[PDB]
Each structure stands twice: as structure tokens, then as C-alpha cells.
DNA sequence: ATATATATATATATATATATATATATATATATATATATATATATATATATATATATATATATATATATATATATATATATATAT
DNA sequence: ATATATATATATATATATATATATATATATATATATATATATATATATATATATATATATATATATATATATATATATATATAT
């Protein structure tokens, strides 16, 4: 399903948002462009989520906790993207991890050991 | 007034038009929009104003330049949301811990300093944040 | 309110448009949609809210983290449905047996634990589940 | 009938759902894609149902009970697909079977012996 | 996102402003023209902002201060464009910098050293 | 009168038509426009008139030719806005400094002279500039 | 902006003035014609204004005074167009200049030397 | 302006006079026809006026007096058109000129010598 | 003007007389038909009037008297049309002429010689 | 005029009689039908009247008497139509003629010889 | 006239009876239906009347007596329609004829021989 | 009748109650809403009554007693709805039945055996 | 019923209060606005009442006492709203509870243990 | 409530004051205008009152004293508005404060320290 | 009657992404409208002074024509209403 | 099978009005266009120079809604397909 249905329908979504009042040379052309951005923008996080799934199976750890392994990973990737503006990533990374890990009950909910592993896997995504 | 209040009608304008261009029923749209503009305006301004107002007053008190408020405001809300998150999902000890650990986290940005630690303490003690 | 109530109009919005784009009659559509939104909203919220509410309150009481509720809620409904299935199709002894055997089954997931066994006992005793 | 009529009309269905307001470069292209997913997604369960039919004839057991042999099989396949996330399939399998079999009056309605045979046939589907 | 979404939607904006009462030979043709002006007009400042981002990373200085590094840069570019009318740019440049730098608390908020660097980078934009 | 007052209706005219051509609701438009024309007329004339009036009277007093007012008016407002900017964002010493440093900056234009320095002193002391 | 936006929107203006009651075979055709006249009619003065801008930079004289260098130039061009009816341009030219220059405080506001230069540049426009 | 704007708008005028109650097959068709008559009917006098302009420049005589050179010329052309009914144009011409010239203060206001020249130029228009 | 404006507007007249309450399939269709009758019905008399104009120029006789040359001609044509019912046109013709000529002060006002010429020209119209 | 104006306006008449309260699917459709009956019903008598006109010219007899040649003819045609019910037309014909002719002062007013000729011409109309 | 005018106007009648207060989806639809019943209901008697007309011509008998040939025929047809309820038509027929004929002065007024012929012609109508 | 007439007219009722003074955007919208509540609110009891009808036929018991089988059933359903507030339904149920059955002459009037059956059927309605 | 009937009729109420003398642009617009305030203003207390209902069922305590569980809860919420002005809510809360609980016979009428539970549930409403 | 109910009803008030004798083109148009003035005129004081509420919470001072914090603030704002006529605001401000503070028992009733803070907050309102 | 699957919408719990709208803080840019100060240009309307032209209406004098209504004299026809 | 009205059309023959068109000959208004020559407004565009709003896009940084898509996990409807 996620192999193709996304771009096909996502384009349909935008067409609807653009409205039937907008000539097709704009309606479709804008749609296609915005979709391409969705595909490119979405993928990086999608890759993380898929990787996380495999990590948990590898570790032999709970499926429910994916809600947080994912949240944790996704939050950090946003942070890693921001680091391309902040610079000094070494310090930014440590700081994001510091709370992402330490605030166990709200930022992890998952073993700090596995949370860090995710932090490391996410780091590798640049 | 106008810069926080009129947003109701401007937001309304689009939400209606978005649907209107779909060939939808005028009445259903008016209803769906009404609910949308209410949820938008109400939830946004309630949570945001409480934080933004405290944030603005504190930062001004502390001689923060207008170009500096963005950092502290962007944090103000982010932090304020994490405060709710904890009040909702975590033990009181974790709410307190997270608040302090987040203040530390915020160091990732050049913005972070006393101003942030002061602001978060206020949010925790004062504001019933929506999230 | 809005997060359970407004769904009536949002669901309505599509159901009408789905048909509208088929060139169907405005009146017939309005009627078909009305029945659809009623069935959807009524059946869904009635069954779901009873389970979800009990589920949410029990899990919160038992210090369940917000990220944990999904497991127990996904089970809450699945289990609650199986409860109806048995109340409808099986002898009382089988309803009781199945409830216990399902609690065991649920062990397939890391989620399963005391929380589940407590929740199902409640559903069996309390909620007139739709299925 | 089921040899071809499904993909032919299923595509027609989607076209209708998409709506006459959507340009054909989207209406048909989306339709065809979604259908392909139907074909691929559907088949695994279809194969089980067909296999079940033959098993009952082989065993010499009731046709009516197909309602449950099918329900039982289909439920388990969903479970087997989930096992690709859960891991430790050996234990998940046992647990699904434990109740699927034990709750006779509501999960089987069929001899546990034949229910298990189906559980085994379904298992082989990965 | 900013690689293409701007021209695509900006055109849509104008179409809306023009109004549904205006024939398409005017609505779209005017839209496309005005957009082209947006692209050309916008770019010069966009380039500065992007350059500024890199300068701060290079210097190892605060992200928040971009509000002013940008404001400072953008203000000066406007001034540099005006210099093409004023002439004697050598003097105009000095004067713009004089206050842009000196009024620290309201025109810079950033180290005068880095503010000047930006003034120099902006100058190179002609 | 007409050259400052009638602008309300002329501005209104477009703001309504802009939206009217979008197929928007007459009532919502009338409301959105009303707020727009108010904000426009009020904010503009209040801030502008105070500066423009003082600017016009001072420049006329100082024997400034009608073709010269543009420079001093364009500065009058720009400067007046910077005055607010400082009253809002900077320490009093910086407001005073900036005013003087800006007068210097203004030298970039052939316009700058005593007239400007006089005008800014007035704006700082007299006018509650909107910005 | 002034390279194309004028004809594009100016046409839109007229369309509005013509009114939605007038059939498109008249609304657009009249619009296009009137616009073409705008382009041709406007240009001569536009050229002067652009030339004046360059003259002041060349001379190294005040920008503010463009209000008058322009007014002066534009007034004279109107006069030069009238000379194509009046004849004896040599005398008409002198007379227009006589007051255009002499009434310094209201017709020039600019050095008579530079005002005359403009009078000469304008003269060359026929 | 007078090269095209006349027929374009004049048509618009008539459309307005005809009224929005009249079907377009009549509104436009009548408009176009009446306009064509305007163009043809107008031109003869337009040509005279343009010719008169040049005559005065040629002679080196006053622009203000065009009010009368034109009035004089236009009046005579009307007379020349009437001569196509009256016949004996030689006598009609003389009579029209007799008063057109003699009543200096009200029919000429212009030198009789130049008035006659116009009478001669107009005569050549048949 | 009379070359086309008549049929164009005459149709407009009838449309007005028919009224806005009458459906266009009747309003225009009736209008067009009635107009065609106007054109055909009118022409015969129009031809006479035009011919009369030329006769007077040919003869070298007064323009004012056209009021009667026309009245005389038009009256007789009506008579000639009636002769297609009366028969014995030779006698009817003589009788119409007898008074049309003899009652000089009220039926001619024009030389009997020229009146007869018109009677002859009209006769040729059948 | 009588070549087309009749059906065009007659339809308009009925439309008026039907009333503005009656939907157009009835107003026009009824109108058109009734008109067609007018055309068909009217023609037979129209033909007689036209024939009568020619007969009088042929005979060389008075135009005024058409009032009676027509009345006589029209009355008889009504009688001939009635004969299609009465039968024994030979006798009915004679009887209608007997008085139509004999009551000279009120049924003819025209020579019995010519009245009979009309009776014969009318007879031929069946 | 009777070839079409009946259905056209009869519909108009009903529309009037229905009233202007009744929505057109009812006013016209009911009208059209009721009219169709008029056409079908009316025709059977219309056919008789037309047949009777021809019978009298065939027989060579009085036109005035149509009042009774018609009354007689129409009365009997009503009776024949009733016979489809009464059965034993052979006897009902005889009885209707018995008085229809015997009461000469009030049921016939026409020769019993011709009255019977009509009774026979009507009988054939079933 | 009860398949549709209820919602159709019930809406009409409310419209009347609302009054002709209330604008239609309120009159109809309120009506429709209140009706929907009638439909939903009514149905539960309607279902019981229909079920009761069938039970009596099944049992082979008196029709007249429906007055009480219905009253009994309806009363209990009200009680069952109240139990959703009271909780401990097991005890509330017993108590409602205790008197509903025991007070034979006023709460049942029907065999306690059949009354209990109804109590059981009603219980199943939740 | 309470799912929609409130806003529908409440609007009707206000319309009545406004009066038939007030133009609809005010009558309805004011009505709708005031209703929206009712919905928003009402809900907070409605939520408490609904929550209280469930608490009593959960606890297994008397329905009658809802009169006080509700009164108690509603009173406290009013107090909690006031605390947003008073500040120092910790102390205000304690004081409201002090009497709300202590004055058993008039402020509770319900076990202090359950009254406190309600005080706690209400507190969570902010 | 105060978010919208004011303008809605305030307009209603004026309508009532204007009277039912005044035509709606005046009644509503005047109403709307006067209301707009209410909104604009009212707001400045409303803002102060809201600010004061927050100041007292911030300070941790008595709610009852709002009667005076408000009175004090409102009085001063009136004074600040008057200063736009008086000029020399520095002195007017001091004088208003002098008594507003000094007459403790009647102008403040609140700590002079907090009264001054309000005087300062009000001052910032211009 | 029970259970799947593909899509479409809404929910439950948390978190992303693409776009759409509004905000918070400051500053650009493209267009749209109004202003400030002076001056053009294209069109739209009105004026000042005189004179045309195209159409639209009315008149002065006489006479047609096409239609619309009424009359004068007799007689039809199509429909509409009432009578015998 | 025939008539009396009224409204429409027609025939023979003519007229009085009213509205439209035309001929000869001319004018008074009104609306449109033009010539010579200039201006006051209003709406559009532009030049020099700057700003207040509103709508769109963007930069830094973050959020509240709404609509779409996705991940983990499950369900209630509706529309399509399938198995018995």
C-alpha cells in the first residue's frame, strides 16, 4: 500500500484543496510539485520509522513502545535537521539526548539503553 | 484587539472557501467552518496568550531586546507544551525533572539562559496549557 | 466536545461529496448521508466511548503512561467486541472461558498484563458492546 | 468469474469514488494503482480460503463450517502478518492458537482437530 | 520546499486576487508575469538570507540573532539598491553603516564586528 | 476632509471586491472588510497625520519648497518609526543615540539637514508613533 | 516590475471600467486597444524620466530635486508636443524655458544651469 | 489615440444606448453597423480639420483661430454636401463664401485671405 | 446611413413593440419577418424619391419643391398599386393625373410640366 | 405583408390570450398549434377572395362590388363545406344560389350574371 | 380544428382548475395525465358520432335528426360499456333497444329502421 | 403507514409549534433536528411493542392483553434506561419485576409467566 | 436529546426575547452569537455533571445524592473560575473545600469522602 | 461573553433608542455607526481593566481593591487623553498622580506603591 | 450470518510530513488599496468657447412605409366566453 | 346547427392617433466620439521618496486548528470486491 498509494492520492488531496475554480494548468502542475516535495520531505522520517521497527525486533523489545521509539526518533531527526543551522552539532546532539533520555516518563517511556541506540541510529542519518 | 480577535474571520474566510471550491453544501460548510474557527481561535489564543503574555512581560522586565523574544517565545510555547505533556502523562517528580532537564536541553540553542529557567518555572506554576 | 461531536459534520462532508461527484440527486444524497452519519456517529461513539472511557480511567488509575494506552485501548475494543460476540453467539460458560483464554492470547503482545485482565472483567460486567 | 471480473470492476469502483471532478490523468492512474494493491493485498487471503475449501473436502467435513474455517484462517493470517512486527513468532503463534482453539463456541465452532490443521496450513503461508 | 513551491502557489495567489470575473487570457497571463517579477525581485534578498545563515555558522555565533543579521542585511540591500539612484555610493554606504551599526540596541543587537561583516557581504551584492 | 476621510470608502470598495470575486459570503466579507478599513484608516491616519502635520508645519515655517517636502516627509515617517522602534525595544540612551545617529545616516540623501534634526527632535518629544 | 507589469494590469483596469455587462468581444478588444495607446502614449515621458535620473547622477546633484527635474521635463515635453501645432518652435521653446527657468521657486527649485540642461535634453526628444 | 480608440469605444456607447434588454444578435450587430457609419460619416470632416491644422502652420498663423478655421471649413463642407442636391454648385459655392467671408466678426474672425484659402481647400473635397 | 441603419434599428423597434413578455423565439422571429416586409414595402417609394431628386437636378429646378415632387410621386405610386386591382389603368392614370396636375395650388405647387414628367417617371415603375 | 406577417403575429395574439400565468410548454405549444389551424382554416377563403379579385378585373367590373362578390363567395363556400354533411349537393347548391342570386338587393348587389360566375368558381373549390 | 386543438387547450383548462397555488411539478403533471384520459375516454364516442354522420349521408336522411342519431348512439354506447359489468349482453342489448326504439317520440324521433341501423353500428363497437 | 408517515408529519407538527413568526432557517432546521430525536427516541419502544405482538402470537395468548403486555414492557424499558444511572442493575431489575409481576390486577393483568417472559425480552434490550 | 436540541431551541428562545420589531439582520445574528456563548459557557458545567454521574456509579453510591454531588461540583467550579482572578489557588481551594465539606448537612449531604473525590475531580478541570 | 455579546446587543440598544418611527436606512445605519464608536471608545479602558486584573495577581494583592485599582486607572486614562489637549504632559501627569496617590482614603484605598505602578502602566497607554 | 481486503471519513494515544489559515517577534518581496508632495499618461464623466458627426427623442411643413389600436360598411377565419 | 360580444388576422376601400424608419430642409435637448486649448474629480499605471492595512511567499524559531498521507495498534460507518 505505502509503496505507491501515497503519491497517487496525496496528489488528489491537493487538487481538492486548490479548488475547482483554478485552471488545470495550475491545479495539476501545482499539485504534482507539492506532492514531489511530500515524497522527498516525508521519506527521511519514514526511513527512521522503518529502521526503528527492525531495531525493536532485533533487540527483542515491546511493540507498543514504538509509539515512543518513533516519537523519540522523529523528534531527534527534527533536531538533527536544525543542527544544520545551529552548527556545533556535537553539543546540540548531547543536549537533545540529555533531556530526551533523562525525562524518562515523558520523553522515552523506553529503556534509556534502547533510547540511546535509537539516538545513535538517528544520528547516522545526518 | 484586531491582531488577536480578527483572526476569527480571516481564518473563517479560508475555511469556508476551501470547502466552497469543492462544490459542498453552503449550510454544512458554514457549520463545519464555525466549529473550525471556534476550535482554532479558542484553543490557540487561550494557550498561546497565557504563555506569550507572561513571556512578553518577563522578557521585557529582564531587558530582552525585541529580536530576542523569538527565541524565548518559541521556547516558551515548546516548553509550556512539554509542561502539559508531563502534567498529563508523568509522575509529579518527572514533571519537575523534565522541566529542569529541558532547560538544560534548550542549551542546544544560543537562546537558552536564566530567562528560560524563569519562564518555565512560571508556566509550571501558572498556566493550564492546552495540548 | 468538539473532538467527538464535530465528527458528525466532517464525516457528513465527505459522505455527501463522495456521492455529489457521482452526479447523484441532492435530496437522495442528503438523505443517504444523514442515515450514514447517524449510523457512524451513533454506533461508533456509543460503543467506543463506553470502552475507551473505562479504559482511559482504569489505565490512568493504574499509572499507565500515555504511550501505553494504545495497546490497552486497541485491546480494549478488540476484547470488548469479542465479549459481545460471545454474549450473542456462545453459552455463558464460553463467554467466561473465552474472556480468560483471550487474556492469555493477548500475551502475543508485550502489552498484555494485569491491566488487560482488569479491563476485560469490566467490559463483561459493564458495557453493552455493539457488534 | 473471480478469475478476472474483480480487477475489472474494482477499478470501476474507485473511478466512481474519485469523482467526475478529477482529471483522467489522476482518476485512472490512481484507480489502476489502488487496484493493483487490491489484487496483491487480497490474494493471500483468497489463497487461504481456496485451500480451506479443499481441506474440508479432503477431511470429509461440513460445508457450513466454512464460515468458521475461513474466519479462523483469516484471523490467523492477520496474526501471522502482525508477527512480522512482533517477532518471537513461536510464542505469538501459540497464543493466537490457544484462544482461537480454546474458545470453541465463538472462535472455532469446528473440531479443534480440524481447527488446528487449519492453523498449521495457515502457518505455512508465512 | 522553497525550491519550487513558491512560484507554483504564488501564481495561484494572484489568480485569486485577479478574480473569477476576469477572462483566463488575462487572469493567467497577468499571474504568470507578476510571478516572474516575484521570482526575480525576491531572489536578491533570498540570496542574502541564505548567505547570512552560512556566515553565522562559519563565525560560530547565535541563531536567534538571525532576526537581526537578516534585518540588518535586508535593510542594507534596500539601501544598496537606492544607491543606484543616489550615486556617490561610497558615502551613502558609510552613512547607512554608521547608524546601522551605532544604534546597537535597535539596528544591530549583534556584535558590531559581525554586523560589519554582514555589511561587507551585502556590499558585494552591488 | 475628503482627502483623508473618504479613503475609508475607497479602500472599503476594493477590499470588498477583492473578496467578492472569490465567491465568498457577503456577510463575512462585509465583516472582514469593516475590520480592514478600520485598521487601515485608523492606524494610518493617526500615525501619519501626527507626523505629516508637524512635518508640514515645520517645513513650511522653515521656507521649505513644496518639492522639498517629500524628502523630509519620507524621512519624517521613516524616522518617526525608528523612534517608536527604540522607545519599544531599546534603553532610553539608545533611543537618544539612535535618533542622532540616524540624523547622521540620513546624510546619505541630499535631503538631510537642519530640517531633519529639528523634525526628529519633535517626533521623539511629541508623537506616540504606531509601529 | 515596470518592464511588464504595466500593460498586464492596465488591461485589467480597463476591463473593470468597461463593466461586466459588456460582451467579451468588446470588453477585451477595447481593453487591448486602449492599453496599446497607453504604452505608446506613456513611453515618451517615461524615457524622459529615466534620462533625468541618469543626468542627476552624472551631474552629482540631489535626488529630491527629481520631483522638479521630472516636473520640469514633463511640462516641457507637453510643450514640445504642442509645438507640432504651434510651429515656430524656436520661439515657443524660448518662451517655455523663459518662465520655466525664471520662476525659480515654483517652476524649477533646481539650479537654472541644470534646469536648462534638462530643457536641452528634452528638446532633443522632438 | 484617435487612430483606434474611437471605433472601439463608440461601439461601446451604442451598446449602452441599445440597452441590456435587447438580445446580443441585435445589440452588437446594430452597434457594429452604426459605428461603421460613424467612421465613414466622421472621416470627411476629420480630414478637413487635420488639413486645416497643417494650413495654419504653413501660413504661420494663430492656433486659437482654429476654432473658426475649423468652424468655417466644417460649415462649408456641410454646404458642399448639400450642393449634391442643389446643383449649380458654382453659384451655391459663391453664395456660401459670400457671407462666410463677409460677416467677418461672426463667420470668420480670421483674415478673409486665409478664410478663402480654406474655402478653396474645402472645395477640393467635392 | 440609409444604406443599413434602417433594417438594423427598425428590427429593434419592433422588438420593443412586441414587449419583454414575449419569448425570444417569437420576439425576434416576428421582428425579423416584419422588418423584411418593411424593406420590401419601403423600397418602391424610396426609389421614386431618389429618382425625383435626380430629376430636379437634371431639370435645374427648386429643391424646396421636393416636398411636392415627392408627395406627388408617392401619391401616384399608391394609385399605380391600386390600378393592379382597378384595371383599365389607362383611364385610372389619366384621372389621377387630371387632378394631381389641375389642382395646382394643392396637388402640385410645381410646374405642371415637371409634375407630368414625374407622373411619367412614376408610371414606368408599374 | 400577407405572405408571412399573419402567422407571425397571430401566434403572438394567442400567446397574449393564453396569459402570462401559463407555463411556456403550454403557452407556446398551444399557440403554435392553434395558429397552424388558422393557416389551414383561413386559406380556403383567402384563395376565393384572391380569385374573385382577378375575376372582376377579367370581367372589367366595379371594385366596390367586391364587398359583395366576396360576401357572396364566402357565404357560398361556407355552404359548400356544409354540403359535406348534407349530401345531395346538387340540390343544396341550387338552393343556396336561388336566394343568393334572387335577393338581389341584399344577397348580391351585383349582376346576377357575375354572381353566378362566382357561384361557379366557388363550386369548383369543392 | 378537432385534430389537435382539443388536447392542447383541454390541458390549459385543467391547469386553470388546479390553481396557481399548486407547484408546477403537480400542476402540469396532473394536467397532462388527466388530458390523456380525456383523449382516450372521449375518442370512443367521437368515433360513433363521426360514423353516424356518414351513415346519414349514406342513407340520404335528415341532418337535423343527428341530434337524436347521436343521442341514441351515445346512450347505447354507455349501455354497451355497462354490459361489460352486466354480462348477458344479448339480453341487455335487446332491452336497451326495446325502449330506445319503441319510445319513438322521445328516444328516437328518427325512423326505427335507421335507429336500429345505428343500434347495430354501435353494437359493433363492443 | 408507520414506515414513513411518522417522520414526514411529525416534522410538520413541529413547524406548526415553532410558529410562522420564526424565520425558516430556524423553523425547518430545528424541526428536522427534533424529528431526528423523535425517530431515535421512539424506535427502542417501538421495537419492544412489535416484539411483544409476535410473542403473544407465538404463545397463543389474548390480543386484548397487549394493552398490558405493552404497558408492562414499556414501563420496564424506562426502568432499564434508568438502570444506566442507578447501576447494580441486577437488583434494580429484580425490584422492578417484583412489583410489576406481583401487583397482578394493576401491573400485569396477564399471566405472571408471560409477564416474566416479556420482562426477559425487555431485559435483552439493554 | 441534549446532543443537539439545546442549541436549536435556545436560539429560538433568544429570537423571541429580541422581539419581532428587530430586523432579522440583528435578530438572528445576535441570537446565533449569544447561543454560541451558551454552548461554550454551559459545556464546562455539563462535563462536570456527566462526570459526577459516572463517579457515583463507579463508587456504587446513591442517585438521589446527585442533587448535592452536582451542587457541590458546580459550586466549586464557579470557585475555580474565580481563582483565575484570586490567584493563590492552593489556599482558595482549601478554603472552598473546608466549608463545602464541613457544613455537612447543607453543603454536602453526602459522605465527606465522596465529596472530596468530587472536589478533586472538579479541581482537575482547572 | 465579552468577546462578542457587546457589539451584538449594544447595536440592539440603539435601535430601540432610535425608535420604530425611523426608517431602517437610518435606524440600522446609525446604530451600526454608533456601535463602532462604542467598540473603539470602550476598548482603551477595557484594556486597562484587564491589565489591572493581571497586575494584582502578579503582585499578589487583594481582589476587592480592584474597585479602586480600576477607578484609579480609569481616572488617569481620562487624564492622559486630556493631556493630548493640555500638553506639558510631564507636569500634568505628576499633578494627577500627586492627588490620585496622596488622597489615600478616597483616591486610592490601595497601597501607594501599587497605585503608582498602575499610574505607570496607564502612562504607557499614551 | 460471520470474516477478510482495497479505499474513503471519523475516532482513541503519541509524533512526524506536505499544504492551507491565523498567530508571536523583526524584516524583506510581489501585488492590491489609501495616503503625503509635485507632475505626467490612458480612460471615464462634467465643464468653458465654437463647430462637426453617429445615434436617441421631440418638433416645424407635407407625404410615404412597417407595425399597433380604434373606427366606417359588409363578410369570413382562429380562439375565448355566453347562449338555444 | 346557428348567433351575440370580445380579441386577433384578412379582403376591398379609406382615415385618426401612437411608435419606428425615410425624403427634402433645419433646429432644441441628451448621450457618445472628435478638433483646437485647458481644467476639476474618479479610477488605473508610472517616476522620485516613504508608510499604514490586506492578501500571498520567504527567512529564523515555534505553535493552534483544518485537510491529506504515514507509523504502531485497533475499531465504527459507507462503498466496492470475495468466500460459503
mmCIF file of N, CA and C in Angstrom, chain H residues 10 12 28 32 38 40-42 56 61 68-69 80-81 87 97-98 101 107-108 115 120 124:
data_model
loop_
_atom_site.group_PDB
_atom_site.id
_atom_site.type_symbol
_atom_site.label_atom_id
_atom_site.label_comp_id
_atom_site.label_asym_id
_atom_site.label_seq_id
_atom_site.Cartn_x
_atom_site.Cartn_y
_atom_site.Cartn_z
ATOM 1 N N UNK H 10 -16.812 53.918 -29.332
ATOM 2 C CA UNK H 10 -18.057 54.344 -29.892
ATOM 3 C C UNK H 10 -19.006 53.153 -29.949
ATOM 4 N N UNK H 12 -19.022 50.690 -27.931
ATOM 5 C CA UNK H 12 -19.468 50.512 -26.552
ATOM 6 C C UNK H 12 -20.596 51.462 -26.207
ATOM 7 N N UNK H 28 -25.216 43.855 -30.601
ATOM 8 C CA UNK H 28 -23.891 44.021 -31.179
ATOM 9 C C UNK H 28 -23.939 44.296 -32.669
ATOM 10 N N UNK H 32 -22.293 47.532 -34.330
ATOM 11 C CA UNK H 32 -21.215 47.488 -35.292
ATOM 12 C C UNK H 32 -21.576 48.246 -36.554
ATOM 13 N N UNK H 38 -20.482 55.756 -38.436
ATOM 14 C CA UNK H 38 -19.785 56.843 -37.756
ATOM 15 C C UNK H 38 -18.440 57.048 -38.383
ATOM 16 N N UNK H 40 -17.302 56.276 -41.377
ATOM 17 C CA UNK H 40 -17.409 56.815 -42.725
ATOM 18 C C UNK H 40 -17.919 58.251 -42.728
ATOM 19 N N UNK H 41 -18.923 58.520 -41.907
ATOM 20 C CA UNK H 41 -19.543 59.832 -41.835
ATOM 21 C C UNK H 41 -18.617 60.872 -41.239
ATOM 22 N N UNK H 42 -17.896 60.470 -40.210
ATOM 23 C CA UNK H 42 -16.987 61.329 -39.477
ATOM 24 C C UNK H 42 -15.763 61.724 -40.296
ATOM 25 N N UNK H 56 -2.604 76.209 -41.309
ATOM 26 C CA UNK H 56 -2.229 77.291 -40.421
ATOM 27 C C UNK H 56 -0.741 77.287 -40.115
ATOM 28 N N UNK H 61 0.127 81.185 -39.070
ATOM 29 C CA UNK H 61 -0.955 81.955 -38.495
ATOM 30 C C UNK H 61 -1.458 81.326 -37.178
ATOM 31 N N UNK H 68 -12.283 78.902 -35.539
ATOM 32 C CA UNK H 68 -13.017 79.404 -36.682
ATOM 33 C C UNK H 68 -12.579 78.795 -37.992
ATOM 34 N N UNK H 69 -11.294 78.508 -38.156
ATOM 35 C CA UNK H 69 -10.880 77.888 -39.406
ATOM 36 C C UNK H 69 -11.629 76.572 -39.531
ATOM 37 N N UNK H 80 -21.179 71.882 -49.112
ATOM 38 C CA UNK H 80 -20.756 71.160 -50.306
ATOM 39 C C UNK H 80 -21.506 69.856 -50.449
ATOM 40 N N UNK H 81 -21.833 69.234 -49.330
ATOM 41 C CA UNK H 81 -22.627 68.025 -49.377
ATOM 42 C C UNK H 81 -24.034 68.355 -49.868
ATOM 43 N N UNK H 87 -27.350 71.320 -56.898
ATOM 44 C CA UNK H 87 -26.773 71.520 -58.220
ATOM 45 C C UNK H 87 -26.326 72.951 -58.374
ATOM 46 N N UNK H 97 -19.676 81.289 -49.596
ATOM 47 C CA UNK H 97 -18.475 82.047 -49.336
ATOM 48 C C UNK H 97 -18.810 83.516 -49.088
ATOM 49 N N UNK H 98 -19.719 84.077 -49.887
ATOM 50 C CA UNK H 98 -20.066 85.487 -49.756
ATOM 51 C C UNK H 98 -20.306 85.885 -48.310
ATOM 52 N N UNK H 101 -17.419 84.665 -45.585
ATOM 53 C CA UNK H 101 -16.313 85.609 -45.549
ATOM 54 C C UNK H 101 -16.749 86.994 -45.054
ATOM 55 N N UNK H 107 -18.543 84.966 -38.819
ATOM 56 C CA UNK H 107 -18.388 83.804 -39.684
ATOM 57 C C UNK H 107 -16.935 83.467 -39.946
ATOM 58 N N UNK H 108 -16.039 84.421 -39.704
ATOM 59 C CA UNK H 108 -14.632 84.181 -39.928
ATOM 60 C C UNK H 108 -13.877 84.405 -38.638
ATOM 61 N N UNK H 115 -9.304 82.678 -44.903
ATOM 62 C CA UNK H 115 -10.621 82.078 -44.907
ATOM 63 C C UNK H 115 -10.934 81.564 -46.297
ATOM 64 N N UNK H 120 -11.212 77.252 -50.446
ATOM 65 C CA UNK H 120 -10.683 76.590 -51.631
ATOM 66 C C UNK H 120 -10.263 75.152 -51.319
ATOM 67 N N UNK H 124 -12.071 71.483 -52.768
ATOM 68 C CA UNK H 124 -11.377 70.360 -53.395
ATOM 69 C C UNK H 124 -11.841 69.009 -52.844
#
